[PDB]
From Swiss-Prot, chain A:
Misc. remarks from the entry: Present with 1720 molecules/cell in log phase SD medium.
Cellular compartment(s): Cytoplasm
Cysteine disulfide partners in this protein: none
Keywords: Cell cycle, Cell division, Cytoplasm, Meiosis, Metal-binding, Mitosis, Protein biosynthesis, Translation regulation
Protein name as annotated: Protein DOM34
Source organism per UniProt: Saccharomyces cerevisiae (strain ATCC 204508 / S288c) (Baker's yeast)
UniProtKB/Swiss-Prot annotation, chain B:
Organism: Saccharomyces cerevisiae (strain ATCC 204508 / S288c) (Baker's yeast)
Outcome recorded upon mutating residue 422 to E: Abolished ability to trigger the No-Go Decay (NGD) pathway, without affecting the ability to promote degradation of non-functional rRNAs
The protein, known as: Elongation factor 1 alpha-like protein
UniProt KW Protease keyword: no
Residues noted as binding GTP in the record, renumbered to the chain: 79-86, 218-221, 257-259
Note: Present with 2750 molecules/cell in log phase SD medium.
Length: 386, 516
């Protein structure tokens, strides 16, 4: 990301005027958590070509829409963000000039033109992701490949998410009557060839530093020598130079799960390439150690987390940017109070960014949870539920 | 050029009759409608008779305008993963007489190598395991052998933990279940863990209605074929089986070596290494199973509606890529060849070309003929007129009568929990293992616990009365049109599933209801 301007008007202390440039899909996700509905975005497009009717007839130009925002089409994997709206129109003639009033309009984001955000609820949490990550150094380094005896998934561990790229899969050996109808072996060879081709295209030994290979069984180990066989066949020095970015791991299931088994479990990653993955893995670790050893020291849920805040008992408050930017403003007034109330009774805090596996995991827990200093048995009766 | 709808008011002053006059009079008098009078006064130009004559005329239009096949007994071999359960099952396979087998002895010996790890009927089977690595699993889950009494199916739990799923939900429930244990000190102490997959591999079985179990002590040879270690082994292995639910008196213990072949084919007189044991051999014990009397010939275990779960889909020459060979369990009802099976999911149907009952035997190529099978049995079917895509695993097939079978996404389940490290939080992801299918799922929510709202801890079921280990709503993460399933009530192998967190199995349950 690059921020061209960023200014603080003089009749309005709060919101802002941001002119900014997304550089990759990690900046398309940041922008996501920044634009709010009713904020106004001003772009360039190419809204040329017309009916006929009087004349042929058109012209061209290069017309920019100051569009009110109303909704969004976001697909991170597909590296596509688009914002839908109606024209602000413009405004005095000073903007929108050339635009035909009365006409919805959208802005599909590009990495080449900057655009300006006339923002209303520009906050300190956003400003962190617009001046920290926003991370003109970039530390997120990882790709995975989880594989069962029959399916594999090329994936990309993101500055938050275990985004799939390619749900590959072949005709897996099921053990035939005969010695294994050479069908099994032939099928296996094709498969080895298939993933190699995929990773070769999908990955790029230029920005990535870690590639994780995990499977229940020898399947991950097999895939690693298959990866490098076919490299030495293509003489693919984008992979052969980097024989030291690969790390082979075991996980219980060869589905997406295996990623959070390897990353957050102290088996493979420690403190190797961990920077944006640091802390957040351990805390979500311990959270599930505690809650799950039915010790009453890990809790989830708006009620129970507000309750654990009346006793001051909270050691680590867990919140998400998925529930935050997922849609709504008022609801976060409470969730801030709730942090202060628990800490004023006890704790630090940890916000999970959110297409992430860890943020999804806490999202699957209502985007709110806590770790305690002490056991509080039954925080779920008084208030009525589990 | 046409219809002349001038005159219209202009004429009234040109001719001079006014017009607000005749109007009221005639109307009322007569009893028809307006619009006619204005036309008629123009068409006879301000007349007052001939138009009225027409009017007296006007309304006038009247609106205003059998044979029993004997088994043939199925067994699943269960064990840790290192007792040499494979070496022992291949020895039971060898040739069912035995030796002669002269080619197969050579081929097993070829299987890396003829000189290397040398050979005695089983070491050579073990070297076929080392080649087979190289395309994981070259021989089949189909295996059969024969004994003096019966024809046997074996399916042999792996080898890396997968064929145990090929038996339970998997094929032909098991007349008898075979636990293979290692006599060694470290290997028996391992395997046997409450946590082991071995205990689970036994636990389904006992849940299933698998009433007979045979327990075979492999690897005697390292522990000097010992009396004291063997009786000490019987003494742990049984109280472990009772914790599973098994009947310790009903269980045969047979000392064996898959690796030398002692007590496998002939009784342990052949074994000079143990003189103290006097009892039957491992084939003699398996053969020892009581014959159930086949039919009732044409008769019941479901007459009830047919429900067949589809474990696997695979192509064949005669039978397509699918609607091709299909493998799975007969959840309820019965199926016979030449019959029509309907698959509600694909809204397609097919004809059963062939049926392979339990024990894996008669191949597709040789013969095409074989009678019949009741619930509980696995089948490997062949489907004639249906297309590769049409059936996928998880589908349930049935007849048109009590047809369709219905199917969906999330479901409600009464799970019970065991000893866990972690508990289940509402929203926690787990991996569900129904049949062939193993999928990620979210136990979203925790609707109820014993009968309260809480997270789910260990050993939780309602203590007495209604049993509420936990009432849960489980959602499939993986795919839209997520999974086909049935309630346990109409049929349990479709209905029964296991839940496991990472490695460990946290809980098991029955599917109570189907939701959208």
């Amino acid at each position: 990301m690059k921020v061209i301007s960023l200014k603080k008007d003089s009749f309005n202390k709060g919101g802002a005027v941001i002119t900014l440039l997304p550089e990759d899909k990690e900046d398309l996700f940041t922008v996501y958590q920044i634009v709010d509905k009713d904020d106004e975005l001003i772009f360039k497009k190419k809204f040329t070509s017309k009916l006929d009717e009087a004349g042929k007839k058109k012209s061209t130009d290069l017309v920019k829409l100051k569009i009110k925002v109303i909704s969004e089409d976001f697909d991170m994997k597909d590296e596509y963000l688009k914002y839908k709206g109606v024209t602000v129109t413009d405004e005095s003639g000073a903007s929108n000039v050339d635009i035909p009033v009365g006409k919805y309009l959208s802005f599909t984001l590009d990495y080449v033109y900057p655009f300006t955000i006339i923002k209303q609820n520009f906050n300190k949490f956003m400003q962190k992701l617009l001046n920290e990550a926003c991370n003109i150094e970039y530390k997120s380094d990882t790709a995975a490949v989880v594989l069962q005896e029959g399916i594999a998934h090329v994936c990309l561990v993101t500055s938050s998410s275990t985004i799939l790229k390619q749900k590959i899969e072949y005709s897996m050996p099921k053990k035939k009557r005969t010695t294994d109808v050479l069908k099994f072996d032939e099928k296996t060879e094709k498969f080895y060839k298939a993933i190699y081709s995929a990773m070769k295209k999908d990955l790029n030994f230029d920005k990535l530093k870690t590639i994780i290979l995990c499977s229940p069984g020898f399947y991950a180990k097999i895939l690693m020598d298959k990866i490098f066989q076919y490299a030495e066949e293509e003489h693919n020095k984008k992979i052969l130079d980097n024989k030291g970015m690969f790390f082979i791991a075991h996980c219980s299931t060869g589905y997406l799960q295996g990623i959070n088994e390897v990353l957050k479990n102290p088996l493979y990653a420690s403190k190797l390439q961990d920077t944006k993955y640091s802390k957040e893995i351990m805390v979500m670790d311990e959270f599930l150690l505690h809650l799950n050893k039915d010790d009453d020291k890990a809790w989830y849920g708006e009620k129970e987390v507000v309750k654990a805040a009346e006793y001051g008992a909270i050691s680590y408050l867990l919140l998400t940017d998925k529930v935050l930017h997922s849609d709504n403003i008022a609801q976060r007034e409470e969730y801030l109070k709730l942090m202060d109330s628990v800490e004023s009774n006890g704790g630090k805090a940890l916000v999970l960014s959110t297409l992430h596996s860890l943020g999804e995991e806490l999202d699957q827990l209502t985007g709110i949870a806590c770790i305690l200093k002490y056991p509080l048995p039954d925080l779920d009766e008084d208030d009525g539920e589990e | 050029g046409e219809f002349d709808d001038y005159l219209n008011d202009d004429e009234y002053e040109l001719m001079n009759e006014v017009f607000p006059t005749l109007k009221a009079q005639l109307q009322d008098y007569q009893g028809w409608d307006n619009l006619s009078l204005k036309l008629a006064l123009f068409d006879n130009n301000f007349d007052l008779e001939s138009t009225l004559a027409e009017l007296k005329k006007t309304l006038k239009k009247k609106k205003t305008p059998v044979k029993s096949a004997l088994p043939h007994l199925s067994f699943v071999v269960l064990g840790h993963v290192d007792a040499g359960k494979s070496t022992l099952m291949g020895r039971l396979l060898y040739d069912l007489n035995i030796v002669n087998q002269s080619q197969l002895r050579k081929l097993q010996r070829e299987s890396e190598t003829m000189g290397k790890s040398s050979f005695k009927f089983a070491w050579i089977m073990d070297q076929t395991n080392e080649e087979r690595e190289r395309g994981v699993t070259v021989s089949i889950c189909t295996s059969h052998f024969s004994t003096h009494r019966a024809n046997f199916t074996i399916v042999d739990a792996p080898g890396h933990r997968d064929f145990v799923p090929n038996a339970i939900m998997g094929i032909s429930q098991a007349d008898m279940a075979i636990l293979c244990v290692d006599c060694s000190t470290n290997a028996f102490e391992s395997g046997f863990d409450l946590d082991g997959q071995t205990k689970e591999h036994m636990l389904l079985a006992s849940s299933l209605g698998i009433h007979n179990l045979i327990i075979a002590m492999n690897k005697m040879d390292n522990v000097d074929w010992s009396q004291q270690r063997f009786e000490e082994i019987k003494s742990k292995l049984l109280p472990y089986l009772v914790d599973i639910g098994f009947f310790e008196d009903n269980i045969n213990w047979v000392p064996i070596s898959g690796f030398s072949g002692e007590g496998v084919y002939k009784i342990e007189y052949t074994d000079e290494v143990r003189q103290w044991y006097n009892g039957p051999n491992l084939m003699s014990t398996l053969e020892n199973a009581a014959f159930k009397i086949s039919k009732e010939n044409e008769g019941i275990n479901k007459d009830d509606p047919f429900l067949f779960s589809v474990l696997e889909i695979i192509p064949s020459k005669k039978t397509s890529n699918d609607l091709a060979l299909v493998s799975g369990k007969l959840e309820s009802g019965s199926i016979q060849p030449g019959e029509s099976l309907t698959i509600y999911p694909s809204e397609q149907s097919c004809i059963v070309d062939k049926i392979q009952v339990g024990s894996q035997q008669g191949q597709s190529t040789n013969h095409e003929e074989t009678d019949v099978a009741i619930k509980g049995d696995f089948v490997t079917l062949k489907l004639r007129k249906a297309y590769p895509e049409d059936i996928q695993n998880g589908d349930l097939a049935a007849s048109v009568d009590y047809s369709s079978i219905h199917s969906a996404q999330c479901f409600v389940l009464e799970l019970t929990t065991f000893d866990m490290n972690r508990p289940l939080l509402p929203g926690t992801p787990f991996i569900l293992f129904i049949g062939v299918k193993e999928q990620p799922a979210r136990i979203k929510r925790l609707i109820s616990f014993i009968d309260k709202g809480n997270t789910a801890s260990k050993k939780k079921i309602r203590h007495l009365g209604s049993k509420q280990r936990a009432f849960v709503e489980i959602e499939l993460i993986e795919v839209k049109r997520w999974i086909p399933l049935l309630t346990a009530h109409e049929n349990d192998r479709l209905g029964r599933v296991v839940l496991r967190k990472d490695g460990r199995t946290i809980a098991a349950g029955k599917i109570s209801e189907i939701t959208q």
